[PDB]
Design a protein around this ligand. Structure first.
Ligand code: 2U5
Length: 100
């Protein structure tokens, strides 16, 4: 368990409670998550752990994640994305859960 936060998104939005649909829930459980209801910053921590463990960000100054051949690309619906465009990342995650 853990959290990952950003100044690009209001802090209160990062505390939003969400119930992942089945694919997102599986990715979280694969790196140690134990429940069905999370905050958005917990979802970003587990997704970061998932990105590390699956070796999807080994070049630490590149700023782009390539995911077209991973579960992540199916989840988000894109082949790659910038790690710096935080609002766009939140939009993609919201499509994969029910907000409480
Ligand atoms: C393990 C950590 C080092 C703690 S990490 O920060 O999670 C690493 C993770 C990368 C994808 C693996 N990651 C980043 O590297 C970061 C630092 C990339 C970054 C670099 C520079 C700038 C800037 O100059 O504006 C902005 N963003 C942060 C990114 C992140 C963090 C919180 C929310 C969001 Cl939406 C994104 C954040 C990230 C990006 C996408 C997702 Cl889905 C999850 C986390």
């Amino acid at each position: 368990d853990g959290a990952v936060t950003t100044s690009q998104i209001p802090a209160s939005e990062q505390e939003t409670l969400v119930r992942p649909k089945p694919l997102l829930l599986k990715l979280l459980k694969s790196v140690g998550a134990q429940k069905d209801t999370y905050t958005m910053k917990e979802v970003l921590f587990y997704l970061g752990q998932y990105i590390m463990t699956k070796r999807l960000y080994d070049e630490k100054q590149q700023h782009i994640v390539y995911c077209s051949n991973d579960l992540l690309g199916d989840l988000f619906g894109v082949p790659s994305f910038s790690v710096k465009e935080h609002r766009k990342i939140y939009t993609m995650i919201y499509r994969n859960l029910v907000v409480v």
